């Protein structure tokens, strides 16, 4: 099969570059973070604006949802993370500890924990209820690009400009695995597959890679896009055909066939680098976001 994504809506509102877009686990909403220091919520199916959330002192590089679609966590250059009640827009907690910009964040599946990654080279695990830092991992020797929990929260995967992807035991804080291929390009993003068996990693040499975690081996490689300067989000699209989706520094969204590694579609519309892509939990919908010269989020749909 091949996808046939088409633009349906363009969401406008941010006054500066958009950094991350994420659909609610319930499928109803889309949250967006930006260098304008705000988070905005939008309807996932119509792109209708819903609300704006504020409080950060500096720009936000990432946002993440709780499993019940009720809470959101944000990561900022103000060196803090914030948890928010989406229904009210109120900040429930401000997590402090990082000594430099917080770049990435995610809740575990139970959503009692939040994992964070910073330019301070650390990965931290926090208690959502109290805001306390439960553990600080000396994870890398360079800025941490991404952090993600597996399906049961037993593991955390991390990536860095140091060229490494590492897997950690949530409970112990021990490093269970370090993955690296032949070359050591900086790693700009990482995430577990939805079944937790595989890991998708992006490197700043215009390459995406699929890894079997258990075997510690690279199974697939995806190329064609441009990615050498920015930490762009990538995803597994599993609602229809099995695709790998990513942003690109050529202003396009790329979609590849997971098995053949062929590019099946390139989505044109943005006027600047596509920094983030998100795939809808149940429908064949992709959300895409772009940098300063564009400032828009776009919603695409396929059969």
């Amino acid at each position: 099969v091949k996808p046939n994504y088409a633009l349906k809506f363009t969401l406008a509102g941010h006054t500066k570059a958009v950094s991350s877009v994420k659909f609610s686990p319930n499928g109803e909403w889309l949250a967006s973070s930006s260098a304008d220091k705000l988070i905005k919520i939008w309807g996932a199916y119509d792109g209708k604006f819903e609300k704006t959330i504020s409080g950060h002192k500096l720009g936000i590089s990432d946002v993440a949802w709780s499993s019940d679609s009720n809470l959101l966590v944000s990561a900022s250059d103000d060196k803090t993370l914030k948890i928010w009640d989406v229904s009210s827009g109120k900040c429930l907690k401000t997590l402090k500890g990082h000594s430099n910009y917080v770049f990435c964040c995610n809740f575990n599946p139970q959503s009692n924990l939040i994992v964070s990654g910073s330019f301070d080279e650390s990965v931290r695990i926090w208690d959502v209820k109290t805001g306390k830092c439960l553990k600080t991992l000396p994870a890398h020797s360079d800025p941490v690009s991404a952090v993600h929990f597996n399906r049961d929260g037993s593991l955390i995967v991390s990536s860095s400009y140091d060229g490494l992807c590492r897997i950690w035991d949530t409970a112990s804080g021990q490093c269970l695995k370090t993955l690296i291929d032949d070359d050591n390009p900086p790693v700009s993003f990482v995430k577990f597959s939805p079944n937790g068996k595989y890991i998708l990693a992006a490197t700043l040499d215009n390459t995406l890679k699929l890894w079997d975690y258990s075997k510690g081996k690279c199974l697939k490689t995806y190329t064609g896009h441009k990615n050498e300067k920015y930490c762009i989000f990538a995803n597994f699209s599993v609602t229809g055909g099995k695709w790998i989706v990513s942003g690109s520094e050529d202003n396009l969204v790329y979609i590849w066939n997971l098995q053949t590694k062929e590019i099946v579609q390139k989505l044109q519309g943005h006027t600047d680098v596509v920094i983030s892509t998100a795939c809808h939990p149940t429908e064949n919908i992709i959300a895409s976001a772009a940098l300063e010269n564009d400032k828009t989020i776009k919603l695409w749909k396929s059969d």
Partner: peptide
């Protein structure tokens, strides 16, 4: 900021 490029 993720919106700013790597030097």
């Amino acid at each position: 900021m993720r919106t700013e490029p790597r030097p």
